[PDB]
Structures are given as C-alpha cells and as structure tokens.
Design a protein around this ligand. Structure first.
Ligand code: HEM
Ligand code: HEM
Ligand SMILES: NC(=[NH2+])NCCC[C@H](N)C(=O)O
Ligand SMILES: NC(=[NH2+])NCCC[C@H](N)C(=O)O
Lengths: 359, 358
C-alpha cells in the first residue's frame, strides 16, 4: 500500500516539529511515532491527541499564507467534535460553534474538528451566510451563494427572497446526502450599517452578520484529513465594506452610496468610486463597534501582521505568505505588506479547498 | 550558444512580425536570409525602419506590467542608431523630451539607440528628482539617492532641495560617463493644488510630466538596444499614491491629513485613506489645470480591458502581471483585481539591467 507509506511520513514529520515546538523531548517522539506505525498498520490510519489537534489546529492557522491576521494563532479555541457520529449530534456542535464563536459580541477565534476522512462533511462555505437567487429579472442576495441556495431549495428549503435571507445548515454524515436545519433566528447576531456623519446611510437598509465561520474547507494535520472543521476569527472592515458590499457582482453598493452622498457618477476622474469606498468602510468599522462586535480595520491588521513577522523570526520560523491575498483591498499601498514580497510555499498543517458536492 | 541563438530569435521574430502588419511570406522568406549571412560575416545585423518601429510597439504590447497597452500601436518611434557622439546622444535625449512633452499633449514616444551597449543611459528616468541623506533628515526621492550620489561623484552638484532636476548622465562607446544639465526650459512641471482645499497648494508640492524610463534594454530580434527610452502619460496613482504617499518616498499622507483637519490619532478612522483620495484628486485636478496628459485608474483599467478585448478578437493571447496591473488605491473596483493573468514574457519586451553605479 502507498497510502500508509505516505500518511506515515506526514505523521512522522508532524510529530517531529509538533512535539518539538511543544518543547517535549526526543524519546516521546519515537514513543509516539511508534504507536502510530503500529496503529497505521493494524487499522489503516491513526488518531490524534488533544494537543495534537489542538496545537495542530493552531499550526494550520499559522501556516495559512492567505491570512493577514495570523498574530493570534496560538489563542485558538479548539473543540474536539470527533466523537460525533449522528446527524443530530453534528448539528448541535455546529449550533454551539456559532454561539461560543459569537460570544454575544466579543467574537472568539475558534475551530471545531469533526470525525476525519469524510465521515462528516458540512456543505456550507460559511455557517452563517446570505442566500443567493436569480429571479425572472434581477439577482437577489449574495451572488456568491447562488449554487448553494439552488441546492438548498432543491432539498425542500425555501427563503423569503430578501437580500438577506439566512441560509440553513446542511450537512452530510456517514453516507446518503444531506439534511438541513433552519438556523435559529436568535442565534444569528447581526449588525445594521450606519454612518456616523451621514444619517441617510441607513435608508440604504444594509446589514451584515458578525462572525464569518468558514467551513467548506478541509484541515490536514499529520496526514489525517479532517474534511469538516469549521473555524472563524473576526471580520476586517474592508472585507464587508470593500468586497461584500462594493463589488459589481456582489451587493454592488458603491454608486447608490456615492449618489446619496452628493458626488457625481458622471466622471471617473472625480474618484467618486474611491470616496464612496472610504465612507462605506467607515460606516462598517463604525457600525460594528457601536454594536460591540469584534472587528479590526485593515491598518491595524497589517500592523499586527507585522508584529507576527517580528514574532515569527524571534522564534526562528521563516514566514510564508500570499501577497495577492494580503494586500488590503483598500489603500493597499499604505501597509508595509505591499512593499515587500512573500514565499507562497504551503507548510503543513494547513487549510485546503475541496470540491463542492452541490456542483 | 551565442550567434546561432541569435538567428533562432531573429527568425522567430520576422515571422510573427511580418504576419500581423499584413504582408506576405514572400519576403519573411527572402529577407530572413540576408540575416543569416550578415551574422556569418559581422556577427549580428540591423533592422529596418519598419521593423524596429513595430517591433518596439510589440514590446510595449508585450509589457506584462503595463495597464496602458490600449495604445501600443500608436507609439511614436524615433530612429537614432546613427548617433555615436556624446554631444549627439544628448540632443536626441533633448528631442525626446520636447516631442514627448509636446507642450502638454504628451506623445507616447521611444528613441532607439545603437545596440550592444555602444550607448548606455544611466538615469532611471530622464526627468527625475535627486535624493540626499542629510545629517538629520533625508531630502528628495529616497529612490534616486544612490544614483545621485554617483552624479555628485562625477562633479555634479545639487541645490539640495525636494525637487532638483537630476542631470542626464550617459556613457558611450566604452568609458567615461559624461553629464550635462538639462535646459530648464525643457522640464515641464505641474504644481499640485486642490480644487476645494485652497490650503493644499501651501504644501508646495510639484511633479514633472513625462515619465521617460530610460534604463531598460528592449530586446527585439535578438538585438539588445541597451539604450532605448520610452514614455507615456502618467496615471494619477503613480504620483499621488506612490511617489507622494509611501513613507519612504515623499511621505505626504499625514500632513495632507493634518491640513485637511482629520484625526491622525486612530486608524479605525481611516485617516490615511481619506487622505489618499484627496491627494489623488489633488493630482488629477492639477495635471488637468496645466493641460498635461494624465489618466485615472478607473479610466485606465477600463482601457486595459478594451486592450484585452481587441487582443482576443484579433486572435492574440493577453499576458500580464496582476500584481503590477492593479492600481494602488481601490484595486477591487477594476475588472483587473478580479481575474487572473498570464505573467509569461512574450518578446520583444523591455527588461531590467544592472545599474553601473551600484
Ligand atoms: C482574528 C481574526 C482573523 C482575521 C482578522 C483574519 C483575516 C483574514 C482575512 C482578511 C482573510 C482574507 C479574506 C478574503 O479575502 O476573503 C483571511 C483568510 C483566511 N483565514 Fe484568516 N483571519 C482571522 C482568523 C482566522 C482563523 C481563526 C483561521 C483559522 C483557524 C483563519 C483561516 C484563514 C484561511 C485558511 C484563510 C483563507 C480563505 C480562503 O482561502 O478562501 N482565519 N483571514
Ligand atoms: C499610454 C500611457 C501609458 C500608461 C497609462 C502606462 C502606465 C503604466 C503604469 C501605471 C505602470 C506601473 C508603473 C509603476 O508602478 O512603476 C507601467 C509600467 C510599464 N510600462 Fe507603461 N504606460 C503607458 C505607456 C507606455 C509605453 C509607451 C511603453 C513602452 C513603449 C510602456 C512600457 C511599460 C513597461 C516596460 C513598464 C515596466 C516598468 C518597470 O518595470 O519599472 N508604457 N506603465
Ligand atoms: N476575517 C475572516 N475570518 N474572514 C474569513 C473570510 C470571510 C469572507 N471574506 C467574507 O467576507 O465572508
Ligand atoms: N506611466 C508610465 N509610463 N510610468 C512609468 C513609470 C513612472 C513611475 N511610476 C513614476 O511615478 O515616476
């Protein structure tokens, strides 16, 4: 076999840097690699400890090239949801993650591992996410949710068809296909957009959810592949205000914003697009704090990312990254990141993409 | 190895080269031959007015890092493979400036020189500001510190201010870099002032009009014209987003922010951002009140997008460098940022080349 040949290697190099950064020992490494060789053979795969997944989870986040807020990688609250085998059970850990993660405001960076190898498989990109619809004429909702919604709909689900319908959790377990569960109206904390200097900014009837719990991603650690492992940090103004809210294909809100704010859309040379972006992001950063939701602006992130670079060197590790995904989508030339280059090599553990079942 | 390699490149070139302009194999076939012998006798060859012209425009077109390719085929070329005197190489440089600056309506022009380093222009750009590291402080463009140091080494001396015009330093034949200050009359300068903020012009900032990069050697048909200056018309960002904003460049963000009465005590106030905009609007406004060609990124990326269309409808592949294409401010409001490009180098193209003073 050549799955037990590779998997063995991945495991061996994991435990090595893993236990070694933990300041463990050299004996307990072989002691552990031993249990793993014996086990990978008699059973065909092995199982981690909760200092293995725990610290291993934090290592995957540290190793995420496309992430700007890696500073707080060690402060990750990991949850062992591996002992879940029933669809009911899965669901609860997912309702919990949301909760704990939200923390009625001061959002907690948390990851919840599940039975690996695909024994569990959540479908949603993000646990909380707005629906996508394409009606007779007009694109309603979040265009980047179309396919998924059209999959929920096909499973008996139906929305109100408003620009902010909260999609439902829909997971697949042991085999078959999926099941969904509307996600509690009082579980999804939201933030209404208001601008501190333009009162009309609310007639724009805009709003966004608090915690982005990405989940359609697989988590590899030591060779084991955790196809279902939700994780979340806290949003960055630009994310909502410079992408979700300002892109053509998404909620394309820039023009209306500009209009209401008196600028003229006639000529580009007036940079109305840009001025809008500022206010539209100001509104978001502003809004969230006012509600108490944990948020961070793009300037601070970079700065904290810079601290991450300093810290990582003081530890001896070199830093890996992805420039195309680090530069904040707004005034990116005002962050050190932009004036330097990064090595996009992926070091395990890391997070990866995976084919979407609904496509 | 070296001379056979040349024919390989030289052929690959006349083919596609002749293809497009719309002529006929009977020639590519026949004039690709005299280049086989002329390389067996001397050791290279010489282009035709028709060849390096288009072939230069091809290079532009092949610029993976240029958002201004919608006008590749309107590049005013300028032959000068017949200059061999330092005094000559200078007046041509002076020409490029005048013709290009065109009293304002900037003309996209290039000037090809004798190849294989018989001519070497040292300056990054013909018109560019000097840089100094003074005891306490740094003056000018931190970017041209090193080069300037060189100019002073050759006897040049600057009034040590934020906007001194560097001198044109060229090398010819083989040695002794000579320099000669540019006629003040030839450097057109735009004063940055704000359409709404009357107190902006008080920051006493200015900038030249023509970015004539001059230290890249544009290969074409295996011929390295170490010297071959080219330009276009600025894009607001280049000036009010980089040159004037980076903390190492003119670090102008905080003062404009201050002068424009914002709060520079917190980033969650996006004070740098509001400032970037107003500084950029400040440029575009100014350059226009002077009558100098200049494009904004929204309009620019738009055009690049047209260049994309026209490249495909004409059955060509578009190659680019996303990281260089996306503008420094509001990159996610341009089609660019949202798609992927092919950073493959199609020659003829412009390249980098070691700085004789470092
Ligand atoms: C502390 C709050 C956090 C901040 C400020 C932060 C910020 C960011 C930002 C701005 C991006 C780019 C998002 C986009 O362009 O769509 C990103 C991507 C990413 N983040 Fe972080 N993050 C945080 C926490 C986390 C946590 C807890 C994990 C992992 C346990 C994580 C894993 C990732 C991954 C894997 C990506 C890539 C997304 C993809 O490939 O689609 N982040 N993060
Ligand atoms: C129509 C006006 C033009 C515009 C708007 C334009 C704009 C740009 C911009 C904004 C950059 C990035 C500059 C930087 O970040 O330093 C660039 C780079 C470049 N462009 Fe253009 N361009 C124009 C004309 C030309 C012409 C006439 C040529 C060639 C014949 C050319 C050759 C290139 C090259 C080779 C680079 C790379 C410079 C480097 O690597 O430092 N451009 N251009
Ligand atoms: N700060 C984060 N954890 N971001 C995760 C990705 C969220 C995604 N960009 C969104 O707007 O939904
Ligand atoms: N539009 C151009 N051709 N620019 C050439 C590079 C000029 C450089 N960005 C500068 O600001 O001086």
């Amino acid at each position: 076999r050549q799955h037990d040949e590779q998997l063995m290697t991945k495991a061996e190099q994991f435990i090595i840097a893993s236990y070694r950064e933990l300041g463990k020992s050299e004996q307990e490494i072989k002691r552990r690699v031993n249990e793993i060789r014996w086990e990978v053979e008699q059973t065909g795969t092995y199982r981690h400890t909760y200092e293995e997944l725990s610290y291993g989870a934090k290592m995957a986040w540290r190793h995420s090239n496309r992430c700007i807020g890696r500073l707080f990688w060690q402060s990750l609250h990991v949850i062992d949801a591996r002992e879940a085998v029933t669809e009911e059970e899965v669901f609860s850990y997912l309702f919990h993650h949301i909760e704990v993660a939200t923390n009625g405001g001061k959002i907690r960076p948390t990851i919840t591992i599940f039975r690996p190898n695909g024994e569990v498989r959540i479908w949603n990109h993000q646990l909380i996410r707005y629906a996508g619809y394409e009606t007779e004429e007009g694109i309603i909702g979040d265009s980047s949710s179309l396919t998924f919604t059209r999959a929920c709909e096909q499973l008996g689900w139906k929305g109100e068809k408003t620009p902010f319908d909260v999609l439902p959790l829909v997971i697949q377990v042991g085999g078959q296909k999926p099941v969904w569960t509307p996600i509690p109206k009082e579980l999804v904390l939201e933030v209404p957009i208001e601008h501190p200097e333009f009162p009309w900014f609310r007639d724009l009837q805009l709003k966004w959810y608090a915690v982005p719990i990405i989940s359609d991603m697989c988590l590899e650690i030591g060779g084991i592949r955790y196809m279902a492992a939700p994780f979340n940090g806290w949003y960055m103004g630009t994310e909502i205000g410079a992408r979700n809210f300002a892109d053509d294909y998404r909620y394309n809100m820039l023009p209306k914003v500009a209009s209401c704010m008196g600028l003229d859309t006639n000529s580009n040379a007036s940079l109305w697009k840009d001025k809008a972006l500022v206010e539209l992001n100001i509104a978001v950063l502003y809004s969230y704090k006012k509600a108490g939701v944990s948020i961070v602006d793009h300037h601070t992130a970079a700065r904290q990312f810079q601290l991450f670079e300093q810290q990582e060197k003081a530890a001896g590790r070199h830093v890996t990254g992805d420039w195309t995904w680090l530069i904040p989508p707004l005034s990116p030339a005002t962050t050190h990141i932009f004036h330097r280059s990064y090595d996009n090599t992926m070091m395990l553990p890391n997070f990866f993409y995976q084919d979407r079942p609904y496509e």
